[PDB]
Amino acid sequence: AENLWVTVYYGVPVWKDAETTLFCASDARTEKHNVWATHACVPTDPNPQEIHLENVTEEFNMWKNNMVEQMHTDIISLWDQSLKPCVKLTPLCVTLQCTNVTNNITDDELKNCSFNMTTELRDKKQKVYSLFYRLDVVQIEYRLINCNTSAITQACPKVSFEPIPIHYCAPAGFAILKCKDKKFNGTGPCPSVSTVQCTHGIKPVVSTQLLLNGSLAEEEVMIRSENITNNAKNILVQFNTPVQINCTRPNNNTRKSIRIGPGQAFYATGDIIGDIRQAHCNVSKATWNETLGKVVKQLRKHFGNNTIIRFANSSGGDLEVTTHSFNCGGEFFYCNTSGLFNSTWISITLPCRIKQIINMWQRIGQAMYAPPIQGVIRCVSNITGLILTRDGGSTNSTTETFRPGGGDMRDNWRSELYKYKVVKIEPLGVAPTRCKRRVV
Amino acid sequence: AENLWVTVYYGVPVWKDAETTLFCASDARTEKHNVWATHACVPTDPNPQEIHLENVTEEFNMWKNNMVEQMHTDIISLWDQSLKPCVKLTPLCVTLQCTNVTNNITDDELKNCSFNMTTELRDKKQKVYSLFYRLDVVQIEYRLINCNTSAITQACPKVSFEPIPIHYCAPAGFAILKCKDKKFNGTGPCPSVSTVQCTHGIKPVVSTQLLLNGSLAEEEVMIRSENITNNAKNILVQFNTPVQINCTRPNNNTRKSIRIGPGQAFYATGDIIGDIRQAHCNVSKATWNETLGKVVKQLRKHFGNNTIIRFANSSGGDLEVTTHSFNCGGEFFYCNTSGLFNSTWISITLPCRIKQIINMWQRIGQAMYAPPIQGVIRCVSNITGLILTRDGGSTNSTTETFRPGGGDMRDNWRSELYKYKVVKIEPLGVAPTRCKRRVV
Amino acid sequence: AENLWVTVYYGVPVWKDAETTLFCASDARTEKHNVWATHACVPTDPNPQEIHLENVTEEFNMWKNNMVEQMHTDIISLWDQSLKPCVKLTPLCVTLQCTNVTNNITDDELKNCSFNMTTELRDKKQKVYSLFYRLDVVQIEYRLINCNTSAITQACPKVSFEPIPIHYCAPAGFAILKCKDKKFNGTGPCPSVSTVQCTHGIKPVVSTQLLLNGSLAEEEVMIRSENITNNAKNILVQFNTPVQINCTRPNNNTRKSIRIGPGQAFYATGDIIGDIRQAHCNVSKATWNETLGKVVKQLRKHFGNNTIIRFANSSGGDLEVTTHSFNCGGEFFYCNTSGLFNSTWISITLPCRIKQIINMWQRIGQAMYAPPIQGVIRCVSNITGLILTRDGGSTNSTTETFRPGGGDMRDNWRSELYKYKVVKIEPLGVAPTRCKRRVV
Amino acid sequence: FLGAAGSTMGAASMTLTVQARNLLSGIVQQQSNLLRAPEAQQHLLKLTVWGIKQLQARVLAVERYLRDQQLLGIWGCSGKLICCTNVPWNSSWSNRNLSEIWDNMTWLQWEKEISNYTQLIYGLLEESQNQQEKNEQDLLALDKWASLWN
Amino acid sequence: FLGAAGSTMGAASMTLTVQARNLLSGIVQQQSNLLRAPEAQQHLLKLTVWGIKQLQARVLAVERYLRDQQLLGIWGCSGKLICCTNVPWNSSWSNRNLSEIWDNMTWLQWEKEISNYTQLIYGLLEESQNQQEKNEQDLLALDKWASLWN
Amino acid sequence: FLGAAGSTMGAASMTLTVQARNLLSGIVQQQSNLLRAPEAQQHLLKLTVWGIKQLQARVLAVERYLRDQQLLGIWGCSGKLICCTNVPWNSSWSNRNLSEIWDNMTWLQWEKEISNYTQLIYGLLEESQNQQEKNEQDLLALDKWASLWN
Ligand SMILES: *[C@@H]1O[C@H](CO)[C@@H](O[C@@H]2O[C@H](CO)[C@@H](O[C@@H]3O[C@H](CO)[C@@H](O)[C@H](O)[C@@H]3O)[C@H](O)[C@H]2NC(C)=O)[C@H](O)[C@H]1NC(C)=O
Ligand SMILES: *[C@@H]1O[C@H](CO)[C@@H](O[C@@H]2O[C@H](CO)[C@@H](O[C@@H]3O[C@H](CO)[C@@H](O)[C@H](O)[C@@H]3O)[C@H](O)[C@H]2NC(C)=O)[C@H](O)[C@H]1NC(C)=O
Ligand SMILES: *[C@@H]1O[C@H](CO)[C@@H](O[C@@H]2O[C@H](CO)[C@@H](O[C@@H]3O[C@H](CO)[C@@H](O)[C@H](O)[C@@H]3O)[C@H](O)[C@H]2NC(C)=O)[C@H](O)[C@H]1NC(C)=O
Ligand SMILES: *[C@@H]1O[C@H](CO)[C@@H](O[C@@H]2O[C@H](CO)[C@@H](O)[C@H](O)[C@H]2NC(C)=O)[C@H](O)[C@H]1NC(C)=O
Ligand SMILES: *[C@@H]1O[C@H](CO)[C@@H](O[C@@H]2O[C@H](CO)[C@@H](O)[C@H](O)[C@H]2NC(C)=O)[C@H](O)[C@H]1NC(C)=O
Ligand SMILES: *[C@@H]1O[C@H](CO)[C@@H](O[C@@H]2O[C@H](CO)[C@@H](O)[C@H](O)[C@H]2NC(C)=O)[C@H](O)[C@H]1NC(C)=O
Ligand SMILES: *[C@@H]1O[C@H](CO)[C@@H](O)[C@H](O)[C@H]1NC(C)=O
Ligand SMILES: *[C@@H]1O[C@H](CO)[C@@H](O)[C@H](O)[C@H]1NC(C)=O
Ligand SMILES: *[C@@H]1O[C@H](CO)[C@@H](O)[C@H](O)[C@H]1NC(C)=O
Ligand SMILES: *[C@@H]1O[C@H](CO)[C@@H](O)[C@H](O)[C@H]1NC(C)=O
Ligand SMILES: *[C@@H]1O[C@H](CO)[C@@H](O)[C@H](O)[C@H]1NC(C)=O
């Protein structure tokens, strides 16, 4: 043939994998003082134009994904930005003269503490009623647990904690791929992909050991891991059935407002109406038994169909590695979920404790104080899966043991950003053809 | 005719009404530590190129104007940014052992208070002389009024409070219209408009009930309202005559510097030279009588020429809705301007009080403390109009009653941004002509 | 000839002198918590492409240079940004009951002070061991020197103070010239210039009276001044020989951690191992004698070869204008460098004192507190020159006197940004030629 | 600048006789005030109120000032302030007298005429500009010597 | 948008038949979401988390969206979405069958072919575009009347 | 980059023989350092000193790098690095010998010659480019068949 000639083509549909910043997008509905809404960052969220491609088998990854770190670092930054302008509680770390409570059943408990406080005109102090839990006070008669670490600034009561769903929208010159293959496990070439400009609604919940409200898979309940071979890797599992958790807190929980110095009110738990019962969550034993059977039957796909045993969350660590922990309406629960794991191989209540002073929910250092909630607390929604660990050890052939591990928060959003990927767009392409310029 | 062909035209002089941010512009003159200058934000302010158009009757609005909110929200943001790095006075909210003053005439007054203070080496406290006013202390012997609300950080003494005029300049792709019709009342099609790049000098003064230094209209003193029909609408009025207000404060007002802890000086009023008189503002009764006659004669244009009565402020409320309040050289006056409103239908002094602790000048919450000014305070400049309210009620035909209402601050700048409007520029236009491309 | 026609040329290599912002650039090596690294601002620092021009004699200036102010204002801004999140020491300004130390030689000294402190549960105070120096406490038995000025927030111990070198890179549309003439004194037309995109490695050290680690000149040790004529101008001098300063601090300096309130640790000097000697720096007298001979022989170039005398820095004044002051491994030295200046016309130790509380190293106002360093401190590197002052006066002909002045910090970086200049690029140029457009 | 916006398009036929009455340079010469002092302020002040409000307004003018240059590029009209098309005055049913248009009608009134179908015109332009014309240019890649115009 | 990226270049010869499958306007119409609400939020909030993260991402798209317009300008191809050169298909040793290329090969696979020497092509383009051609245009500044084509 | 700035325009006639001695790509390839690490830093740090100082410098280069592209568009010279005009070398009284200019004079010295009247040249260019030429192109909208060149 003749000598061809290179011809540029501007707008070629090619892409490379890249890394860049994204941005939230949500909708309007007043009271946009939500700690993740940041008063409606991009409040548009327009109609979701989605385009299939159908002729490309693009590879994916969930364990090298970059969006989960951008999700994780924005959550902590939206956390402290919300927690900044509220009231410090550095005058609260004092000695506490405490005693027990006596109105109702044992095995709940609480402590009746009082202290010199209210600090109003810099000159007059008062002996103040207060009612604290356990697991936040220590002896020496008492002090708060966090006074050997740093400050204890409280939450503003006007803000909320309902994780309204957000949408990550790509900036210009970038695109969001989305694997539509309903059996894409964790990592590899997805045969059926599609392109969106923004993600779907992603509720930024926070829960150890049991991820709630999710994005439920299809009826093959999927198993997700980096590699099954290494025992030191957490295992994600996704559901297909919205199993319910009817959680509640029994008591009525009267608030008591305290003046501290200048116009800085402080809210402490007043004396409650007087029916001290236990916080608990009812789970139907039948449906829970059926979901584990679907789990173990696809667990036997990965290795030999023999001797599956489940165990209590690993002993030791700080509540947050052992109990299924979460919040319900701005009230932070800690449930001994031992009673879910016996050996499955061929209604349930759960004892829920309550902390009020919380650590930084990932870090050590600064710590927040939850205000009390008036009335009776009850909330309920679905689970979507668990975080499990294979123990391994000397079990060369049999007695396979699983315990519901998981302490990191990134594995929550890894379970929802698995089917997304970001690519840059390179609109400059060249090709040889038979055209040549007419040189004047 | 033949089929025409569409022809683009890039740079067509069309516009749409839009909303965008603007920016200040001023001039240089050291001591640019002015709370609105923000150390000369755009210190250029070049020559004012103004272009008339003469063939367009463009509509306007002053009650849907967007620039007043951008003016209002920048003033509060320039306020708190100035008030941030100064000294907090949270050690000042203590008990005060007070007594009266005895040197001069009654009906002025002041309180001789003392307290344990100076807090210097965290260990030594002192009984400190102080001299406070009334209207900022309450009994229980005394405390400051703001200690049941929030903190009381003081002003830095090096900054000033003279409202130097600024210029709002449009960004690129936008334009500032300006109605030149000298009888444009509030809202409608202005026949003679013109375009500027920046506004004129706008002094950001703050005054209830009597707006000062203004932008004076022509000899028809204009009446401005949203609608005359609704009685619950404030009525702006613009002058044409610079009536003078010779304000002064009599006393000499010695300062007294106090050391508080680390290097945080505090300024309190020392014992004055000893001629305790009243703060007052002299107004010429003749010229004030003539201005009201021009007002009422154009008030009779809007409705029947009968029975105009003016009143003092009604329904009580805080000072700031009842007294004409302002500052004079960083000293905040409150004058019972009852003596200006009798029934006009056919030299004056005014009792001025002084607060020192001021609330947030719009909001509730944080509050500033004015430092004292040494020497004798006297200042004088023009008025440009009032803010009035029609009462209405059962007065179906006669006895029309007006009282000088007005509590909002946006109506100040509504009286000066009425003759301005911002438009985006859409330089892309199409038209059919007789040209067609020569296709190769 | 015929009428020529103007022809634009886009990308003409012309320049004008301009002023704009630059940015740092450095390299990676963890522990990027350096107070000037700002966690590796631009951590690239690529290969230094340098281009000579060889046919242009471009003028320079070092006394009208703009980059030194951008260097100076970035250092203070990187200072306070590092000093912001650390611990305030406003509870430390209390009365101190002090006494001397008795273990070793006199003429070192230190004070054994104790105070009511540790403030842990807002209610319990303790008598605390502490060991302070002199030159930071005053009588009334004692208090810190800075409690009559402002607060005394301490340094975070995890950060460092080693001045790692940075690179100022020009932004787009700008260029950095660089004079290669090895005898360019301070100001004038440099015959051999070259262009770089980024500067070389510039260590941002801070030292009065003796600039260390430098950028050493060629063997003609250069003399730099604005003009020799005015006596009120500092004189820079650049070396060519890396003379060594073996500095050390003898003692072992045990740390003692103190709990203050909430989780705010405080580090005070514990009781040392017990060999109290003097801090000193050994300088070889031979090499120091030879360097001064090269200095005076080129000093005689500027004026008559007669009667050169050098002096101590007069008497009185502060430390920072009199002693050669610096830090060594986060430990701030003050050495009476009297013993370097006798009349030169034809091993040395130096008594080094230590402050711990430092002022703002240029300003008055806020002040930092250095934490102690454990172990034995010893560090050594080169000098590159001095800052001298001509006294003048009535010495019309003879007895020329020099004293090592210099209090400003800008003259440090003036000694390294002298051979650099920034220019904007104007790529639009026109010229007449013989071409004309073919009008259709 | 905007000197004959109130005029009719006949008396704004002089606007296209001049630099679109200096509209395009007016889009960009308004930047010169904020070009002149974004840096010349020498103040510390620890904080910037206009550090975003200027910068948000500054890049707003750039993107708006680039969408048109991108749109004139997509219609082959980049650089040309005035250019005609190959799409005719189509069946757009705002069909009328020419000397009604280029004699007595303002540009604002002209905008009020064709406010509708403006996006319909805008999609219509790139059809004839690329989807027929550029492949017709690829049909000009033959260069025969004996049977060119058969 | 990206509607036939998975196709071969033969079935992406329809992409160049359309607006490069709407890629270039897709580069700039994605800005319209952040064009629509950067200011419409009316909140004080005293502090901005996205005050830089949006603004850094916003000007990142502009500079990337201008390097290509600068690169098409340097190859004389500004405005032209498709243009050929004077540099031929050179000794670049990825020499093969044409109807292997424009029938059965994706653009991504085509990128995998000439991922190397891509910068070598890019330097090669401006050589014939300026270093011979523009001075050849300066050689067209003669305008004789009797001895033009000697 | 800037490799023959010290040369005369005769020895910078080789600069226009090359890519204006790589000046225009040098305007934009200097952005690639700040293109390479604005985001690759993974640090929290709660506050940004260069969050504005880079961003102010970044958009300063864009607007300056767009005023020229806007100015070459207004003179019909967009894309052309070198183009002549219809305005001749006018009565601008810096009239001299050509081989004084294109043999022995630097561009900086050439700037020192015509530092004055530079804005007078710049207004002069758009006069012949639009105010006569574009309406002369509108005079080419006739297409007769029997009496074209009367
Ligand atoms: C589980 O899913 C629910 C589904 O919405 C999440 O929202 C919670 O929904 C319940 C309704 O069952 C809300 O309780 C009540 O809502 C009424 C509405 O009229 C309100 O007036 C009451 O004051 C009460 O709040 C509940 O507020 C709402 N939010 C929370 C935080 O419980 C729920 O968030 C999901 N739970 C988890 C752990 O993801
Ligand atoms: C009313 O209009 C005046 C006109 O300037 C505004 O400025 C005030 O002007 C007076 C002069 O009559 C200033 O008083 C004195 O100025 C001298 C100048 O030599 C100065 O040395 C004295 O220390 C004293 O300040 C006055 O400072 C100045 N500013 C104020 C705040 O009064 C005045 O602001 C206007 N008043 C209102 C309420 O708008
Ligand atoms: C003078 O020049 C030296 C050259 O590096 C600057 O760095 C200092 O170098 C000394 C080494 O002689 C360091 O001392 C020791 O380094 C070892 C490395 O193994 C380290 O493990 C020890 O803990 C000890 O630090 C010294 O750290 C280092 N920095 C300082 C601040 O002294 C030195 O900065 C230059 N001095 C001046 C005043 O410019
Ligand atoms: C999940 O699906 C992926 C799809 O690629 C599988 O990944 C690879 O599969 C091949 C063929 O079986 C193996 O040779 C590779 O080792 C697999 N890589 C990885 C990272 O797994 C994978 O086998 C599937 N299953 C699991 C448990 O990951
Ligand atoms: C102020 O001038 C405007 C100019 O338009 C007048 O506004 C309208 O006038 C027409 C005719 O009189 C009325 O039908 C409308 O109801 C008016 N609208 C409004 C909002 O006023 C207006 O009448 C003049 N006077 C006042 C007091 O506004
Ligand atoms: C340093 O070198 C510069 C190079 O220009 C000299 O500067 C000028 O030199 C001429 C001729 O000797 C004098 O007329 C000027 O007064 C000099 N200007 C300045 C600012 O010095 C200079 O003489 C050299 N020496 C010093 C000590 O600066
Ligand atoms: C839980 O599952 C049900 C059943 O599909 C669904 O309707 C609901 O939206 C889910 N989420 C909740 C209750 O938050
Ligand atoms: C008040 O009115 C007079 C009279 O026109 C004018 O000269 C002066 O500038 C006005 N403003 C003042 C005194 O602030
Ligand atoms: C000091 O001078 C020596 C000799 O050239 C050199 O090797 C060294 O890098 C210099 N700097 C130091 C020790 O910091
Ligand atoms: C306005 O229109 C009139 C026609 O009555 C015309 O004479 C005048 O020039 C026009 N002015 C402008 C600025 O267009
Ligand atoms: C994918 O390729 C097939 C050829 O087997 C073709 O029929 C189809 O149109 C292609 N689809 C796309 C979206 O390119």
Residue numbers in the entry:
A (entry chain C), B (entry chain E), C (entry chain A): 31 to 59, 63 to 141, 145 to 176, 190 to 395, 411 to 504
D (entry chain F), E (entry chain D), F (entry chain B): 522 to 671
Which lines from the publication concern this structure?
Vaccines targeting HIV-1’s gp160 spike protein are stymied by high viral mutation rates and structural chicanery. gp160’s membrane-proximal external region (MPER) is the target of naturally arising broadly neutralizing antibodies (bnAbs), yet MPER-based vaccines fail to generate bnAbs.
After purification in dodecyl maltoside (DDM) using the PG9 Fab for affinity chromatography followed by size-exclusion chromatography (SEC), the recombinant gp145 was reconstituted into nanodiscs with a molar 1.5:1:1.07 mixture of palmitoyl oleyl phosphatidylcholine (POPC), palmitoyl oleyl phosphatidylglycerol (POPG) and brain polar lipid extract. For gp145 by itself, the distance between Glu662 (the end of the C-terminal heptad repeat; CHR) and Trp666 (the beginning of the membrane-immersed MPER) is ~10 Å. Our structure indicates that the MPER-N segment is partially buried in the lipid bilayer, consistent with a previous NMR structure that showed the MPER to form membrane-immersed helical segments. In our cryo-EM structure, the distance is 30 Å, while the distance is 53 Å in the NMR tripod structure and 16 Å in the NMR stalk–bubble structure.
